[PDB]
From a paper:
The Elongator complex is responsible for introducing 5-carboxymethyl at wobble uridine bases (cm5U34) in eukaryotic tRNAs. The highly conserved complex is composed of two copies of each of its six individual protein subunits, Elp1-Elp6, which form two discrete subcomplexes known as Elp123 and Elp456. The modification reaction requires S-adenosylmethionine (SAM) and acetyl-CoA as cofactors. tRNA binding to Elp123 triggers SAM cleavage and acetyl-CoA hydrolysis that provide the required reactive groups for cm5U34 formation. In this study, we present a series of cryo-EM structures of human ELP123 in complex with tRNA and cofactors at four different stages of the reaction.
Next, we conducted a structural characterization of the ELP123–tRNA–acetyl-CoA complex using single-particle cryo-EM. After 3D reconstruction and refinement, the obtained density resembles a 2-lobed architecture, known from other eukaryotic Elp123 complexes. However, while one ELP123 lobe is fully resolved the second lobe is only partially visible. The final map has an overall resolution of 2.87 Å (FSC0.143), with some regions reaching a local resolution of 2.6 Å. In our ELP123–tRNA–acetyl-CoA reconstruction, we identified a well-resolved ligand density that unambiguously fits a complete acetyl-CoA molecule, confirming that the native ligand is bound in a similar fashion as acetyl-CoA in GCN5 and DCA in bacterial DmcElp3. The acetyl group of acetyl-CoA reaches deep into the catalytic cleft of ELP3. Acetyl-CoA is predominantly bound through its phosphate groups, which are coordinated by a Gly-Gly motif (Gly496 and Gly498), and several residues located in a loop of ELP3 (aa477-497), hereafter called the “acetyl-CoA loop”. The tail of acetyl-CoA reaches deep into the catalytic cleft, where it positions the acetyl group close to Lys280. The high quality of the ELP123–tRNA–acetyl-CoA map allowed us to precisely trace almost the entire tRNA molecule de novo. We find well-defined densities for most tRNA nucleotides, with a slightly weaker coverage in the tRNA elbow region, as well as the acceptor stem that points away from the complex and does not make any direct contacts with ELP123.
Author numbering:
A (entry chain B): 119 to 510, 537 to 826
B (entry chain A): 719 to 1025
C (entry chain C): 10 to 547
Write the structure that this text describes.
RNA sequence: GGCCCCAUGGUGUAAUGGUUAGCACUCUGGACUUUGAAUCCAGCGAUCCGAGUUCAAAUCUCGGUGGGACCUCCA
């Protein structure tokens, strides 16, 4: 605040882990460092800035590990220590200033489980003080210079609240706001603690004490407490941030002023996501991550609005190992693979279908398709070990998405299978389009451990072992023609396995090598990370850390080739960085467009357009189509990309001419995103 | 191994040669009770306190000496003399050993350097037979509102920390309340971890009261019932029913009888109450005798017939 | 209903207790419990935990010294928190094809979701299983239990159990250690060094960490890595001093490697604790006595602590197959008790015995030990034979105070010197000779000519342990009925600083310490260098 | 209101005038630096209240207090 008409000068204070506090000023586009303060080998844990009453001198309060608060005032052009306040006996985790009338208040919390309020005012005129017949606390006084005038200020403690058991993590006043022009300045305080609780405090006018008004939270369970708490503009809503990362939001009733109810808030993983799949009909997605959880997201349909929003409704796993891979078998059944030698199979209970058809707005009879019939009701945690047990939890109908207390307990899925046969932790899983086969791989350092295993989907037994490669298999893919299987490995090679033809209706077909690649024939100089098929089962694309995406083609003509004709059918491209994901749109255009979605280590997503030259020059096969912006991109490695292969809707009946194509992405930045692209442009 | 015989012989020679420094170091290192410095020969110790103080010349060592002094004699319970040819005993210690030691050493310390030896004088006052908390609190209060002259003085914060080290906070709070001085009470309550808006109204209410009634109220708040009844007695007649209620409640009949003269009617009332109390406890003959003394003749008949 | 009757009984009990405290008289708890339970018509008695869990705050502070439960949990001067790692395979599975012939459980076993050498039915195992092996949750849960008992958790020491911890990837070890330190302090750090700084400035002191490791994973690299973590104790399984046993059980190393690892660890400044196993195959009843006599008389072997684990046969192991085929038979119980008594009679006065038998539940054992109090039976047998045990654990003030009823009277200073692992060791102590009661101890060693650390080269003497026993006294507090904060520590350091200068001839003294100990030694006059607290002696 | 019988650890129960009351559930402590709750082994805890007769009473005579069986009375 000043009267030189500046470009909104700003003062900034920061504190870091190098035992120092720094001050900055920002005049327009120019910044400069006014001062630095050194605390020896201590640290500063909280900061707050404001101005002294009835003047324009900035003041600073710093809470330290010394269980002691420090006050600084800016006389002249530098900050100088004026006062030190004792009283606490543990670390301090938050301070805050507030202005009331012509006086200043300071609220302080600590790990002592206690909250203290101080008070700063302007000392008297060195006169009119004659009431010596009273008992008053000693005042902490300091003097400042302002325009060649001495001004004295005094600080004194106000009260000491209590009521918490564990640490108190944050404290905040209530912001001022304007109603019909007039500013209202309530007196309220909020605190959140580690013992799963939040307390709202207000003063009492009949006496000189403060009283609890609302105490919100869930006391009980192994879940830990809260880190942060925040008010609304006027105080209608209150928000809190939990230990894992869950968000809790409470709203107050209009007529009943001591009743609060929780509401719907965003949610997501609290660690790196590792895999992603789509609904076969396209109405939900399932994700797994290194946070040992599996989550399902589906849209919400409301009558009195037009926009559609997607929310979490299911969490069908809370596991004891880091999850790595997932695959889809039926519309309500999937396979998961984690940091162990065992693959697991999960199915869905009954109340999930009712909740799904209720929220998404479908019909219960039609979503069953009279094909699921009787099935278990829920799941629960077993007494010992890691598994899922049917509860044939509690019948709880829902018309709105749940909150982060019904998701944690009442939303599990039963386990119905368990497969052995691997010697080490799983690394990759895939499935064919005919819904009857399954692949697998594991970490290996020799040739006898890196072997693909094929299973069945009606009676789970090993079918045949495919021994090749000497290192881990990173990804596999089934051609849409259901007559091939491809593998890429850490040993910079690859292999293609062809299925032999027999009629033998009671038996099962077999696979054997059709083409391969050695050190010399390999073009990727480093680890291959991804591969994918063309929608017509003709070519296939590979992407590796060599910053190159290659097309290997002419895999068609399965009738009778001499041996093969497989080789490089394009030119290498230097994307710019390591490629960790490749995907191809499942849509065919008469102009023969093959669009590829390439992800990188830096979270960029580039859409190219590949065209077969059909001429002996290989130029004009790589064209750059579109690239993600700096706010639409990720921040760390991208681990998966998957278009919406809505095979159930073979042709889009109710669409705006299919103007848009949707796909989804996930990465190690704790984030899952859904992107949309214009059709006619590509 | 350090055999006790050789150590004790060397220590006795050192003590007889007036070389307290070496003996003190050896006893401190080997964990030998320090009382042997005095109990070996009290007359020589009390005759040469100055040399002791000069040779030890450390605040920490003197504080260690004070926190181990005890009334018992160790040359008869822990370290009996191997030779029974004691030269004499002579002067029996006149009073409490702790008192003589503390007074003599405090006098020497005050004579030599009031500023250098600050916490040790407070320790000498605290460690006496009767803890004189009032004097040390008053001295700390004096040191609070003063400026140093010699750059060896101790800040009031450090003195308060040392007092809180010797005695607990709440006990100091109660003693300060007993001192009838609100300055000391506020000083102690500053470092007490308490809500100011729980005891500020209490102290304000206590302040605006009559002096004797104030002292009675504070004493009752701190038990101390005899002082409370004395202060209440030194007041107006209208308070007498409450004084008598307290006398009957805690059975302070004898003290109340001592408080007033026998010619007073209050003495007669307290006597009647006391006699009724013995009637409750079946001391028929004594209470009847005391009824006859005061003048309750018919009650004397009743008690004498009953017994 | 019984519930409200129980609640009223509890409330009345605290009412009487607080009243008696207010007017200041002593009260007997058991009689009050019985009388008050009689009034309200109950068929049971109150529990101590329930009475503790209902006291008002100020009274909760004041009257714990009367309602404490299990006084042994802090009778040694510290509070112990045990945590476990993630399931994994032992490192020597690859180049041998299999693991030790007697180890139960593990990733590939019928004991589901259990760590190697454990079954999962153990107390600590069931605590980490429900926490899904997360260090933060385990530390918080255990500290909550310890506070609920009624103890003081000012001073803490960690114990990391599981398989071989130092064989895991570096990132996981970083994660684990920084989470332990953060759980104590309250910070949210990114790597080890930040967590160590903040824990140094913390108020809940971390005294030290203990890790179990194999002799082939104790080299210069691993020792330096553990030095940066804050570790101060090591546990190695020797199991035998005979070379044929170490290769017939597929152990994977040799005894000479064990001796060399002992030498390196002791020169670096750690403390060594050894696991030993009687009743091994091909070892009769006469080779055990010779084994332990050589253990405690040969300078190459003399450790600082011992763990006696008589051999147990458990299903799903090679020893189980040997036992079924009628080729291995265990000792008779009388012979086992006699052997344990004879072994305990040989322990030197500078060695501490931490545990005497395993803790596998009885129904899971096919043969071997069946009782559950081998130590006290052995002590009774020793009293019958006329011999006495003189280790460290059964001579300290707390144990002598709870098992017997004695208190020190005539404290003296004792010093013992010896040679071990190529070094000159000294052991200083304060103890009562007549009643045989220990109070405080310190260990000192002169660095040999084969030290590799940069901070300890050129004439440095290192202090390896300083300890004072009794009950726990919180920092900056004093209790005249306990033994800790009374000046026995600065007396033990002043003597260590005189030996290192006038006898060793050194010119510097170094101490390995935790973090609260870092502040303590800074108070004494030491400065910080690397992971050590050093001071010039010139 | 008389009218027959019952009463032992916190709870369910055993024992004949001796020269000193046994078991179960509950509770507390140790083996234990892997554990309040599991295992093994130790420990604390009672003849309601008065008179009494017999050398001697938890035990037999007569009492009050509660309880159980009969009708109460009574309003
Ligand atoms: C370095 C290591 O390897 S660990 C040391 C052993 N670990 C333990 O804490 C278990 C028991 N330890 C102890 O008994 C003590 O903590 C020791 C060994 C460090 C010192 O023993 P004591 O005889 O109690 O020390 P001494 O009485 O000489 O010192 C008391 C002072 O030390 C302080 N102190 C004790 N422990 C600590 C600590 N961890 N951090 C900071 N100060 C401490 C006390 O507050 C007291 O200071 P003050 O009274 O002046 O305010
Ligand atoms: C954790 C410690 O347990 C001991 N240990 C391992 N297996 C057995 C067994 N079958 N019986 C007894 N002790 C055993 C070893 O000494 C190991 O180091
Ligand atoms: C947990 S077993 C003891 C530690 C290590 N596995 C060893 O055998 O030495
Ligand atoms: S090294 Fe230890 S934990 Fe591993 S198998 Fe051998 S005994 Fe078991
Ligand atoms: Mg009964
Ligand atoms: Mg009976
Ligand atoms: Mg009977
Ligand atoms: Mg028990």
């Amino acid at each position: 605040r000043r009267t030189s008409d500046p470009a909104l000068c700003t003062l900034i204070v920061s504190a870091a882990a190098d035992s120092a506090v720094r001050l900055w000023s920002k005049k327009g586009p120019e910044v400069m460092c006014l001062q630095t303060l050194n605390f020896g080998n201590g640290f500063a844990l909280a900061l707050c800035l404001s101005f002294l009453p009835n003047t324009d001198v900035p003041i600073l309060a710093c809470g330290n590990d010394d269980c002691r608060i420090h006050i600084f005032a800016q006389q002249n052009d530098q900050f100088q220590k004026v006062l030190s306040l004792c009283g606490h006996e543990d670390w301090i985790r938050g301070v805050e200033w507030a202005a009331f009338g012509r006086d200043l208040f300071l609220a302080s919390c600590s790990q002592d489980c206690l909250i203290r309020i101080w008070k700063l005012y302007i000392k008297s005129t060195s006169l009119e003080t004659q009431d010596d017949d009273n008992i008053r606390l000693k005042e902490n006084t300091f003097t400042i210079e302002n325009e060649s005038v001495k001004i004295a200020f005094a600080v004194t403690l106000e009260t000491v609240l209590a009521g918490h058991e564990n640490w108190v993590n944050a404290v905040h006043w209530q912001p001022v706001f304007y109603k019909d022009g007039v500013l209202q300045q309530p007196v309220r305080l909020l605190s959140a603690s580690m013992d799963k609780t939040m307390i709202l405090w207000a003063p009492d006018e009949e006496s000189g004490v403060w009283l609890e008004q609302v105490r919100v939270g869930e006391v009980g369970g192994n879940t830990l407490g809260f880190y942060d708490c925040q008010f609304n503009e006027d105080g209608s809503m209150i928000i809190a941030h939990a230990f894992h990362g869950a968000l809790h939001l409470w709203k107050q009733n209009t007529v009943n002023p001591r009743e609060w109810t929780p509401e719907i808030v965003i949610s997501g993983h609290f660690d790196g996501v590792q895999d992603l799949v789509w609904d076969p009909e396209g109405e939900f997605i399932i994700t797994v991550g290194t946070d040992q959880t599996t989550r399902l997201f589906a849209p919400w349909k409301r009558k009195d609005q037009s926009q559609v929003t997607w929310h979490e409704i299911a969490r069908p796993q809370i596991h004891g190992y880091d999850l790595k891979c997932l695959a889809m078998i039926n519309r309500f059944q999937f396979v998961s693979g984690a940091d162990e030698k065992v693959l697991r199979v999960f199915s869905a209970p009954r109340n999930f279908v009712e909740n799904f058809c209720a929220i998404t707005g479908q019909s219960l009879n039609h979503v069953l398709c009279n094909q699921d019939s009787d099935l278990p009701e829920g799941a629960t945690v077993p007494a010992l070990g890691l598994s899922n047990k049917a509860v044939f939890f509690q019948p709880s109908i829902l018309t709105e998405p749940p909150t982060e207390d019904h998701l944690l307990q009442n939303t599990l899925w039963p386990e119905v299978q368990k497969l052995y046969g691997h010697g080490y932790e799983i690394f990759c899983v895939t499935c064919n389009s005919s819904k009857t086969l399954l692949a697998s791989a594991c970490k290996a350092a020799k040739k006898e451990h890196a072997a693909i295993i094929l299973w069945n989907t009606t009676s789970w037994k090993q079918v045949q072992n495919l021994v090749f490669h000497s290192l881990t298999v990173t990804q596999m893919a089934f051609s849409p023609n259901e007559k091939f299987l491809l593998a890429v490995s850490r040993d910079r090679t690859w292999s293609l396995w062809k299925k032999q033809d027999t009629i033998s209706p009671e038996f099962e077909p077999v696979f054997s090598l059709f083409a391969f690649t050695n050190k010399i024939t390999s073009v990727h100089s480093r680890i291959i990370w991804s591969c994918d098929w063309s929608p017509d089962s003709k070519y296939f694309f590979t992407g590796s850390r060599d910053k190159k995406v290659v097309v290997w083609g002419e895999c068609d003509s399965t009738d009778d080739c001499i041996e093969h004709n497989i080789g490089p059918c394009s030119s290498v491209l230097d994307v710019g960085g390591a490629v960790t994901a490749v995907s191809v749109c499942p849509v065919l255009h008469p102009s023969q467009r093959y669009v590829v979605a390439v992800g990188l280590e830096c979270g960029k997503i580039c859409l190219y357009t590949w065209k077969k030259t059909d001429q002996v020059p290989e130029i004009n096969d790589w064209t750059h189509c579109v690239e993600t912006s700096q706010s639409q991109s990720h921040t760390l490695a991208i681990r998966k990309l998957c278009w919406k292969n809505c095979s159930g809707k073979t042709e889009q009946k109710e669409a705006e001419g299919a103007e848009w194509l949707h796909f989804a992405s996930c990465g190690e930045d704790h984030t899952v995103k859904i992107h949309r692209v214009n059709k006619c442009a590509l | 191994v350090h055999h006790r015989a050789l150590v004790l012989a060397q220590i006795r020679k050192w003590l007889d040669k007036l070389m307290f420094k070496e003996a003190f170091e050896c006893m401190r290192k080997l964990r030998i009770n320090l009382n042997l410095i005095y109990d070996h020969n009290p007359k020589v110790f009390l005759g040469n306190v100055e040399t002791f103080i000069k040779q030890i010349d450390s605040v920490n060592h003197i504080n260690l000496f004070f926190t181990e002094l005890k009334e018992e004699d160790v040359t008869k319970t822990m370290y009996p003399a191997p030779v029974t040819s004691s030269v004499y005993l002579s002067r029996d210690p006149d009073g409490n050993k702790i008192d003589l030691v503390c007074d003599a050493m405090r006098a020497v310390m005050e004579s030599i350097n009031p500023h250098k030896y600050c916490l040790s004088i407070l320790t000498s006052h605290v460690k006496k037979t009767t803890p004189e908390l009032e004097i040390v609190l008053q001295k700390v209060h004096e040191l609070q509102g003063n400026a140093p002259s010699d750059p060896d003085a101790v800040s009031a914060e450090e003195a308060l920390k040392y007092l809180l080290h010797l005695v607990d906070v709440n006990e100091l709070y109660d003693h300060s309340l007993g001192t009838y001085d609100f300055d000391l009470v506020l000083m102690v309550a500053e470092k007490s971890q308490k809500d100011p808006k729980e005891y500020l109204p209490f102290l304000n209410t206590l302040k605006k009261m009559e002096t004797n009634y104030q002292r009675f109220t504070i004493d009752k708040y701190l038990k101390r019932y005899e002082k409370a009844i004395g202060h209440l007695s030194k007041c107006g007649p209208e308070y007498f029913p409450e004084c008598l209620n307290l006398i009957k409640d805690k059975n302070l009949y004898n003290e109340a009888l001592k408080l007033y003269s026998p010619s007073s009617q209050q003495y007669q009332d307290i006597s009647i109450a006391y006699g009724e109390h013995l009637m409750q406890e079946h001391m028929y003959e004594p209470a009847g005798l005391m009824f006859a003394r005061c003048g309750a003749h018919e009650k004397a008949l009743s008690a004498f017939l009953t017994c | 209903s019984p519930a409200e009757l129980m609640m009223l009984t509890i409330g009345d009990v605290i009412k009487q207790l607080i009243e008696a405290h207010e007017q200041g008289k002593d009260i007997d708890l058991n009689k009050v419990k019985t009388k008050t339970a009689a009034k309200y018509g109950l068929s049971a008695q109150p529990r101590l935990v329930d009475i503790i869990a209902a006291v008002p705050p100020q009274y909760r502070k004041v009257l714990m010294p009367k309602l404490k439960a299990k006084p042994i949990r802090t009778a040694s001067g510290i509070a112990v928190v045990a945590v476990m790692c993630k399931p994994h395979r032992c490192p020597h599975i690859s180049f041998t094809g299999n693991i030790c012939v007697y180890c139960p459980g593990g990733p590939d076993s019928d004991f589901e979701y259990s760590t190697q050498s454990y079954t999962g039915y153990e107390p600590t195992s069931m605590r980490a299983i429900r926490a899904r092996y997360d260090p933060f949750l385990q530390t918080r849960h255990r500290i909550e239990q310890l506070k609920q008992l009624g103890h003081s958790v000012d001073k803490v020491e960690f114990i990391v159990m599981g398989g071989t911890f130092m064989a895991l990837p570096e990132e996981y070890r970083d994660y684990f250690i920084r989470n332990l330190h953060d759980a104590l302090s309250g910070h949210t750090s990114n790597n080890i060094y930040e967590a160590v700084k903040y824990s140094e400035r913390s108020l809940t002191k971390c005294i030290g960490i203990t890790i179990e490791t194999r002799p082939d994973y104790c080299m210069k690299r691993h020792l330096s890595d553990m030095l940066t973590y804050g570790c101060t104790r090591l546990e190695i399984g020797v199991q035998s001093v005979y070379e044929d046993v170490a290769r017939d059980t597929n152990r994977g190393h040799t005894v000479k490697a064990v001796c060399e690892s002992f030498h390196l660890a002791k020169d670096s400044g750690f403390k060594v604790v050894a696991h030993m196993m009687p009743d091994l195959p091909n070892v009769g009843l006469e080779r055990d006595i010779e084994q332990f006599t050589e253990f405690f008389e040969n300078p190459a072997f003399r450790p600082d602590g011992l763990k006696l684990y008589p051999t147990l046969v458990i299903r799903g192991t090679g020893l189980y197959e040997l036992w079924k085929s009628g080729r291995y038979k265990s000792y008779s119980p009388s012979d086992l008790v006699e052997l344990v008594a004879r072994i305990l009679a040989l322990v030197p006065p500078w060695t501490r015995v931490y545990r005497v038998q395993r803790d596998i539940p009885m129904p899971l054992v096919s043969s071997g030990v069946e009782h559950g109090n081998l130590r006290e039976l052995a002590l009774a047998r020793m009293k019958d034979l006329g011999i006495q045990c003189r280790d460290v654990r059964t001579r300290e003030v707390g144990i002598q105070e709870i098992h017997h009823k004695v208190r020190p009277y005539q404290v003296e200073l004792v010093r013992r010197d010896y040679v071990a692992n190529g070094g000159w060791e000294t052991f200083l102590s304060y103890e009562d000779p007549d009643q045989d009661i220990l109070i405080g101890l310190l260990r000192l060693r002169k660095c040999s000519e084969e030290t590799f650390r940069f901070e300890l080269g050129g004439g440095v003497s290192i202090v390896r342990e300083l300890h004072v026993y009794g009950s726990v006294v919180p920092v900056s507090s004093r209790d005249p009925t306990k033994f800790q904060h009374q000046g026995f520590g600065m007396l033990l350091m002043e003597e260590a600083e005189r030996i290192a200068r006038e006898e060793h001839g050194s010119g510097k003294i170094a101490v390995i310490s935790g973090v609260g100990t870092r502040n303590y030694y800074r108070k004494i006059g030491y400065r910080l260098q690397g992971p050590y607290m050093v001071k010039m002696l010139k």
